[PDB]
């Protein structure tokens, strides 16, 4: 990890919980990561968004 | 003076000198040869001394084949140093030479010129030698 390659949480956009931590390069990938992931609280797949770790 | 123009590695581990020569045990270029009887590391300086010897006897005539080559780097720690701190620096090159190897061959020369020149060359070497003559045994290889 580095200052350009940052750690980040993914937050289920429905129940607002963070369920995954991953990394990205914010120079290559400025936009906030949106990825469908399984949310264990909603117990269903949900579009998760990148929020600050 | 003979040495590999290029090497994948600078230093090699010390050899073992077991066994008769692997190859180059038969005359196959010239008329007479000088064969090693005991194993040794032969230095580039020895080979060169043995070469100029045969030359200045042939008074630049005949031909001289050097059928060993000093590829093995020879390492030596600086004087008066203590053990350790890694391998010494390369200080010269040796050809591993085992009994039965044909080190030199001579041709284009009288039987007396070859016998005599190979004999002088044997004196520049740290081992006992034999002067041999190309046979059909050689020719059958």
């Amino acid at each position: 990890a580095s200052e350009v390659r940052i750690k980040l949480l993914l937050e289920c956009t429905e129940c607002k919980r963070r369920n995954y931590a991953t990394e990205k390069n914010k120079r290559n990938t400025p936009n906030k990561l949106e990825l469908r992931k399984y949310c264990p609280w909603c117990r269903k797949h949900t579009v998760h968004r990148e929020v600050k770790i | 003076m003979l040495m590999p123009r290029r090497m994948k590695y600078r230093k090699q581990q010390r050899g073992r000198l077991k066994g008769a020569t692997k190859g180059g045990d038969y005359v196959a270029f010239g008329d007479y040869g000088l064969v090693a009887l005991e194993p040794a590391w032969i230095t580039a300086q020895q080979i060169e001394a043995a070469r100029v010897a045969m030359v200045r006897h042939f008074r630049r005539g005949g031909k001289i084949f050097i059928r060993i080559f000093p590829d093995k780097p020879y390492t030596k720690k600086p004087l008066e140093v203590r053990m350790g701190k890694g391998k010494g620096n390369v200080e010269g090159y040796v050809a591993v030479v085992k009994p039965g190897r044909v080190m030199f061959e001579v041709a284009g020369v009288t039987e007396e010129q070859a016998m005599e020149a190979l004999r002088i060359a044997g004196h520049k070497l740290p081992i006992k030698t034999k002067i041999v003559r190309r046979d059909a045994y050689d020719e059958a290889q």
Partner: protein
């Protein structure tokens, strides 16, 4: 060519025992047979120093046979510079590759030639430092085929 040399049979004698008994272990083979033989070392030496792998050696086997062989392999003891074993290739009417000496009217002493055993010649002649010749432009007496690539330098 040609030369006559005694040969005997062997089956379970140690090669070391035979060499310690002044004889030279060997084998005698072609497409049709294969026999453990031994020649006498001092006897063989004068035969072979003239009859190299060039000239026919005929093995008077003790059972009356006289098989016509060529010397095909001579494994030498690298230490003592001594024959250690011999291959006697028995000739028969079928063709054979072999080295035939070259005389010149000088890189190569001899040449590999695809011959018939009746067509086995003693000589192949050349003609006239440093200009040199190749195998293509060469004689080839009756019944011999150039058993190299003619691109070889003589």
């Amino acid at each position: 060519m040609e030369y006559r040399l005694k040969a005997y049979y062997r089956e379970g004698e140690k090669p070391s025992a035979l060499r310690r008994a002044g004889k030279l272990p060997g084998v005698m083979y072609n497409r049709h047979l294969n026999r453990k033989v031994y020649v006498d070392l001092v006897e063989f030496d004068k035969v072979f120093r003239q009859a190299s792998i060039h000239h026919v050696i005929v093995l008077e086997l003790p059972d009356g046979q006289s098989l016509p062989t060529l010397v095909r392999q001579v494994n030498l003891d690298k230490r003592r510079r001594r024959p250690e074993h011999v291959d006697f290739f028995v000739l028969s009417d079928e063709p054979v590759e072999m080295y035939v000496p070259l005389r010149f009217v000088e890189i190569h002493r001899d040449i590999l030639v695809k011959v018939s055993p009746r067509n086995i010649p003693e000589f192949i002649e050349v003609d006239v430092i440093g200009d040199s010749l190749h195998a293509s432009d060469l004689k080839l007496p009756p019944g011999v085929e150039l058993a190299v690539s003619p691109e070889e330098t003589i």
